[PDB]
Design a protein around this motif. Structure first.
Motif, short mmCIF file in Angstrom:
data_model
loop_
_atom_site.label_atom_id
_atom_site.label_comp_id
_atom_site.label_asym_id
_atom_site.label_seq_id
_atom_site.Cartn_x
_atom_site.Cartn_y
_atom_site.Cartn_z
N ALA A 1 0.83 -1.20 0.00
CA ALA A 1 0.00 0.00 0.00
C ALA A 1 0.87 1.25 0.00
O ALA A 1 1.68 1.44 0.90
CB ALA A 1 -0.93 0.00 1.20
N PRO A 2 0.70 2.11 -1.01
CA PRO A 2 1.47 3.36 -1.06
C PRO A 2 0.94 4.37 -0.05
O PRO A 2 -0.26 4.60 0.05
CB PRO A 2 1.27 3.85 -2.50
CG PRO A 2 -0.01 3.24 -2.93
CD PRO A 2 -0.10 1.91 -2.23
N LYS A 3 1.86 4.96 0.71
CA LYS A 3 1.50 5.96 1.69
C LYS A 3 1.54 7.37 1.14
O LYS A 3 1.25 8.31 1.88
CB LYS A 3 2.42 5.87 2.91
CG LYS A 3 2.33 4.56 3.68
CD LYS A 3 0.95 4.38 4.29
CE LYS A 3 0.91 3.20 5.24
NZ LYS A 3 1.27 1.92 4.56
N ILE A 5 -0.07 8.52 -1.78
CA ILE A 5 -1.21 8.96 -2.58
C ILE A 5 -2.24 9.63 -1.69
O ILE A 5 -2.90 10.58 -2.11
CB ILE A 5 -1.78 7.78 -3.40
CG1 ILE A 5 -2.88 8.25 -4.35
CG2 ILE A 5 -2.25 6.64 -2.50
CD1 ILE A 5 -2.43 9.31 -5.32
N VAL A 6 -2.32 9.22 -0.42
CA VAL A 6 -3.23 9.86 0.52
C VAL A 6 -2.77 11.27 0.84
O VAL A 6 -3.58 12.20 0.86
CB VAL A 6 -3.39 8.99 1.78
CG1 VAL A 6 -2.04 8.44 2.24
CG2 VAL A 6 -4.08 9.74 2.91
N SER A 9 -3.26 13.46 -2.50
CA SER A 9 -4.66 13.75 -2.75
C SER A 9 -5.26 14.64 -1.67
O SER A 9 -6.08 15.52 -1.97
CB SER A 9 -5.44 12.45 -2.88
OG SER A 9 -5.14 11.59 -1.80
N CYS A 12 -4.11 18.13 -2.35
CA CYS A 12 -4.91 18.70 -3.43
C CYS A 12 -6.28 19.14 -2.94
O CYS A 12 -6.75 20.23 -3.30
CB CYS A 12 -5.04 17.67 -4.55
SG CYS A 12 -3.53 17.39 -5.49
N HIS A 53 1.57 8.37 7.50
CA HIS A 53 1.17 8.87 6.20
C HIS A 53 1.97 10.10 5.78
O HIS A 53 2.22 10.30 4.59
CB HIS A 53 -0.32 9.20 6.19
CG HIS A 53 -1.20 8.00 6.29
ND1 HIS A 53 -1.18 6.99 5.35
CD2 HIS A 53 -2.14 7.65 7.20
CE1 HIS A 53 -2.06 6.07 5.69
NE2 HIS A 53 -2.65 6.44 6.81
N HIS B 63 1.20 -3.67 -5.28
CA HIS B 63 0.15 -2.84 -4.72
C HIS B 63 0.25 -1.41 -5.21
O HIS B 63 -0.77 -0.77 -5.48
CB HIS B 63 0.22 -2.89 -3.19
CG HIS B 63 0.03 -4.25 -2.62
ND1 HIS B 63 0.53 -4.62 -1.39
CD2 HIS B 63 -0.61 -5.34 -3.11
CE1 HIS B 63 0.21 -5.88 -1.15
NE2 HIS B 63 -0.48 -6.34 -2.18
N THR B 229 -8.36 19.39 -10.12
CA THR B 229 -7.76 18.84 -8.92
C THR B 229 -8.77 18.04 -8.10
O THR B 229 -8.44 16.97 -7.58
CB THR B 229 -7.14 19.99 -8.13
OG1 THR B 229 -5.79 20.17 -8.55
CG2 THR B 229 -7.19 19.79 -6.62
N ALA B 233 -8.17 14.13 -7.36
CA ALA B 233 -8.04 13.75 -5.97
C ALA B 233 -9.20 12.90 -5.51
O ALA B 233 -9.01 11.99 -4.69
CB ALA B 233 -7.92 15.00 -5.10
N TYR B 240 -8.20 4.59 -3.04
CA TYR B 240 -7.29 4.26 -1.95
C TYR B 240 -8.04 3.94 -0.67
O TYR B 240 -7.73 2.95 0.00
CB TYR B 240 -6.29 5.39 -1.73
CG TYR B 240 -5.31 5.09 -0.63
CD1 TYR B 240 -4.30 4.16 -0.81
CD2 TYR B 240 -5.39 5.73 0.60
CE1 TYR B 240 -3.41 3.87 0.18
CE2 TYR B 240 -4.49 5.45 1.61
CZ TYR B 240 -3.51 4.52 1.39
OH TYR B 240 -2.61 4.24 2.39
N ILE B 244 -7.97 0.12 0.76
CA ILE B 244 -7.09 -0.05 1.89
C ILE B 244 -7.80 0.15 3.22
O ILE B 244 -7.77 -0.72 4.08
CB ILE B 244 -5.86 0.88 1.76
CG1 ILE B 244 -5.08 0.53 0.50
CG2 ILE B 244 -4.97 0.74 2.97
CD1 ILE B 244 -4.61 -0.90 0.45
#
Lengths: 678, 678
Positions: A1-3, A5-6, A9, A12, A53, B63, B229, B233, B240, B244
């Motif tokens: 799980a990528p931390k 992108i949260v 986003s 943004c 995060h 992932h 945006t 987003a 996500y 997750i």
């Protein structure tokens, strides 16, 4: 799980909220973003789940931070500006940006050494001065734009912002490699080699990749995605190859690439042009939002723990001193700029003094110093002072720039521009009344009450004796100049002249608008018909060279093509001037009140008419083939524009369906792009 | 230094090269991307420096590959669809996608177990079938829209592709968690709850975030970057959070989010819609290019060392079997779709069997199987078979689909369409003849050689007795339907008709063109009038309810607004029919050869007109404020469009500058956006 992108986003979303909720309040959204980053920092310190995060974007590597976020910011500052007004004032903006940045950096450095209690050597102090002297005034540029005149002030401020950011990152990289990676020890000759390498190979590599990508974009038809993709990949490849594979300054390379791509707008299809402007603005906003949030999070986590009362006093005296230093730099360069044909007025000087707002470039360089310092306190104090000056400059200067424009009397709407808009909005009211009258008499919408309709669609105004003979002469001067500009826009609207020639025509119009008692002259246009330069001298030398040897005639073809394109633009501007004078002489004969000044204005207009037709006759005598070529290019433009009007008319009458209309539209658009690259 | 940047930009430039070089050739650009990825893979296997740049992208975490590249692909597939034509035929695409995907997955699983020599259980074979049966035919949809008719077939295939991708990733995720992470041992009730969780809370969470995003988009004014945006987003946050933080099937959340934002185009500003369509197409193009280049690099570095001749024979038999399986699926569901109001013929059945091209979604799932497997042979075999199916489907099916279209006879050009486009191109020819005449009579271009101008401005056509009484009745039906279409397009471009109203009207035109004997009947228009359904029953419940108590008037406001939107659509379509009927009554009385046939058409036209007038009167008596609300919205639209045209007239006349015209255009567009909610 990528931390990540949260955080991206959420940044943004928060920037979207800050733009929505503070667009009427005078403070910008960036100070609100820094505050939200600080709150995110303290909640990251308190709660470990938010720390998990915010960690992977708080601990961003400096190299990936530069290589991702500097090309987008530098390219949008290059792409967004008018390169024609930038090159029309390149000398003044170049000497101002280069010499002013080096002297403002050295003065901030010696101020840091003499006044800060933290024992910094000259390398770290020059690093600090390079960070503090990098300016990003988007807000002052926009506010000077919407307040009418001093457009050249906005172009000057934007251009000096771009060149200042470029050479500031250059001197920052030089002193960063001096003090943080100190392993290099070299002679005088190797230092001369390194300075020559950066300062010359930057623009050269930018020019090389820019010419290659403009040649590639000129030949691509009917796929927009390839064009956007080529611009994006060319920017990032230019910066990455220049910084890493070579030792070339990649910042200047992306600056030059952006300016050249902005100059050759005709190689890109226009729908892709509108897309590219909005696309790089969106990437700009994303980069600024992410950088400000990162700065807030790390300035809460790692920089505020070394804060003292003496540090806050140093921040206040640093703001005052850096404003004074920039103002004094503008002051000493004001005589040298007065030597240039556009001298700074004292109003524009104090606007440029106040208008320097520090931004994401300086914040990013502070983040780089902070992450590379680690346990040493120099990075924390660097970050604290840079973030403090960004916050102070945003708050004070952005909230007071409009007030200062009112105080200077630069913000007042000009009274003829007020009257023309008043007539326009009264005619809009008249057209609204006509549509209401025609819309009351329909068999369906007669039940629609006109009270709510008239309440909805009302456009209010956003604005709301020989001495008298001289004032009459000035009024007639302004009326003739605005009639000439109206005629030039009318010549644009029928497709008579090219956009690039119309830019020069309205530029000569604005030059005549700058001069108070000087009409539109003939010699300034005659210099545009003059072919004399380095290129015809090289043409004579190549004609001697007629009597790599296979690559020489390609070079004589390139030089000849440049010459005939320049004189083709000369023929176009000549045709535009004589057509505009003819239309004005038809029009203005019925509306001048005084016969004596009517004879005077028609006298100067007729002398200009005779002079321009004489010069065009000589130009047609000199080289008739390129005159025939520009006549054919005008023919192609007129026929294809009327065919575009034809397919829009046949779509409007409905006899042709929409998809085959798009097929015909793409056929004529492919033909127009083939014409524009001949 | 980030080594991801050089691979990303190099893949972008390689995709640019492959698209520009191979547009004329029938093979896609994606197979060239795969082959160039393989060449880069073997180069990196030999040369270590190329491995140093391709290692961080070839060994990407699975992932992060899904969480970056699946939201963009799924949202672009959702946004690229026409929501009206998708939901108008939702039942057939839903049953075909769902039941055909589960049937094809079960059959491919039992095929893998029975055919392949390596021992796979039913769970891993179901994973294999899920990867195999996901389809991405953007080429077939592009060609089918390009080849004239069967627009509905293209919408069916596009919707089947989107729901096939969504349900394929759903069944893939549940079996991936069954095989590679078998930590969970669950009861039957927990299994039922988890199935309900994915298959229900996917679209529900998507609907919730989509309504919040649509409401936030409907209120942001004057700024576009906030809209772009917010969409970006919202997409990445939705996927996500669903994947997750919850256990929600997040692919269907992106499906529902994209479908709803695609439905509410009116919430987004009109320039932002064009930007967003091209932006998401660009992002999906970059995702496709990166996925194909990555799967080429990893298939050359990891999968090709474990290949066998038995595996190649298995690949060929698997390709033939997957085509036969798709044929059997759509052939068995053909009577069920015949029970649906639009049924598939055998030509459309074979174009949907052959047109399924496997693509980037399946290759991404192959990549995550390969990375999740580790050193085992299962991931390598998965990657090899998916790469083979993709390259074979591209090379065979994407090149043979055009000649299959020619053989089935659906690629031909319609004779009234061909005649209308020939008339359009002759109108272009005579218009450019008259502009050549007007371009020959000018004293400035009097020496222009018109021969090259004429030879460059040529637009070619791209396509290049009682029994007789019945035949002229049929052709009069066609001419009347054509004139009805003409009047409908004229109503649309005069600003009086709504866009969805024109979509319903051309749907009615196609329905009347399905059977030649029947006119445009009134009964479909009655179904547009008859609002009765679950929502008027809810309205009667609201009338019971008026006699959370503060939230109840908000609920009656929401249901009333839904009824008002339906009344707006009905009033628009009926007003369109009566105005077009009046216009066609003005038109028809000239070209009809037989007077009795003319009266025969006129009687049924007049009865339809009277019926629509009677129904409109019933609607007017039924609800007092809603008719005047729709009439006022039409009034506001007409006067605002005329104000926009007046400001364009003022800009073209030059009395208003470009910046002020931009300001007033912003004012009137803000007024239109305020009209969008009332």
């Amino acid at each position: 799980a990528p931390k990540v992108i949260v955080f991206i986003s959420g940044s943004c979303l928060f920037g979207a909220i800050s733009r929505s909720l503070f667009k009427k309040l005078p403070i910008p959204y960036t100070v609100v973003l820094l505050i939200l980053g600080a709150i995110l920092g303290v909640v990251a310190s308190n709660v470990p789940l938010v720390e998990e995060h915010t960690r992977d974007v708080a601990h961003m590597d400096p190299h990936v931070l530069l290589q991702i976020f500097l090309p987008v910011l530098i390219f949008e500052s290059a792409f967004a500006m008018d390169v024609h007004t930038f090159m029309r004032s390149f000398s003044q903006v170049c000497i101002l940006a280069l010499f002013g940045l080096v002297v403002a950096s050295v003065l901030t450095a010696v101020l840091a050494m003499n006044l800060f209690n933290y024992n910094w050597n000259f390398s770290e102090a020059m690093m600090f001065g390079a960070i503090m002297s990098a300016t990003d005034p988007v807000a002052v540029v926009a506010l000077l734009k919407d307040l009418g005149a001093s457009k050249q002030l906005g172009t000057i401020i934007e251009g000096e912002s771009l060149l200042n950011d470029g050479c500031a990152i250059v001197i920052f990289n030089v002193f960063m490699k001096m003090v943080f990676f100190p392993q290099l020890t070299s002679t005088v000759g190797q230092n001369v080699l390194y300075f020559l390498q950066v300062a010359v190979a930057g623009p050269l590599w930018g020019y090389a990749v820019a010419k290659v990508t403009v040649f590639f974009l000129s030949h691509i038809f009917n796929d927009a995605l390839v064009e956007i993709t080529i611009t994006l990949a060319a920017t990032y490849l230019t910066y990455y190859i220049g910084d890493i594979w070579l030792e070339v300054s990649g910042v200047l390379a992306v600056v030059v690439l952006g300016l050249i791509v902005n100059a050759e707008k005709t190689s890109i299809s226009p729908e892709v042009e509108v897309f590219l402007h909005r696309f790089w603005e969106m990437l700009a906003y994303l980069a600024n939002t992410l950088i400000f949030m990162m700065v807030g999070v790390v300035v809460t986590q790692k920089a505020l723990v070394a804060v003292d009362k003496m540090d806050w006093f140093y921040l206040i005296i640093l703001y005052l001193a850096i404003t004074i230093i920039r103002g004094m730099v503008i002051s000493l360069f004001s005589p040298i700029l007065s030597r240039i044909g556009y001298g700074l007025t004292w109003r524009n000087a104090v606007i440029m003094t106040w208008g320097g707002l520090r931004g994401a470039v300086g914040l990013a360089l502070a983040l780089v110093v902070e992450n590379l310092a680690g346990n040493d306190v120099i990075g924390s104090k660097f970050l604290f002072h840079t973030a403090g000056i960004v916050v102070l400059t945003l708050v004070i200067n952005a909230t007071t720039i409009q007030t200062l424009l009112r105080i200077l009397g630069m913000s007042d709407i000009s009274i003829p521009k007020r009257l023309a808009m008043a007539g326009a909005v009264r005619r809009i009211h008249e057209g609204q009344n006509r549509t209401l009258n025609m819309l009351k008499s329909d068999r369906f919408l007669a039940d629609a009450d006109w009270d709510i309709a008239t309440a909805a669609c009302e456009i209010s105004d956003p604005y709301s004796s020989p001495r008298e003979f001289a004032d009459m002469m000035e009024e007639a001067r302004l009326r003739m100049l605005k009639a000439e500009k109206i005629s030039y826009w009318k010549q644009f609207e029928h497709g008579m002249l090219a956009r690039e020639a119309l830019r020069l025509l309205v530029q000569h119009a604005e030059v005549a608008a700058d001069e108070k008692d000087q009409f539109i002259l003939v010699d300034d246009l005659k210099k545009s018909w003059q072919i004399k330069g380095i290129y015809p001298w090289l043409k004579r030398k190549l004609e001697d060279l007629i009597s790599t040897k296979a690559l020489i005639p390609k070079l004589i073809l390139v030089v000849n093509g440049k010459i005939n394109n320049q004189l083709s633009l000369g023929y176009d501007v000549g045709k535009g001037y004589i057509i505009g004078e003819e239309e004005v002489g038809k029009i203005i004969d019925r509306m001048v009140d005084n016969k004596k000044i009517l004879r005077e204005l028609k006298h100067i207009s007729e002398t200009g008419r005779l002079q321009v037709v004489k010069e065009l006759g000589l130009l047609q005598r000199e080289h008739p083939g390129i005159a025939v070529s520009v006549k054919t290019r005008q023919a192609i433009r007129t026929i294809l524009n009327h065919s575009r009007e034809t397919i829009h008319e046949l779509q409007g009458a409905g006899l042709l369906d929409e998809m085959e209309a798009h097929k015909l539209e793409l056929t004529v658009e492919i033909k127009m792009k083939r014409l524009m690259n001949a």
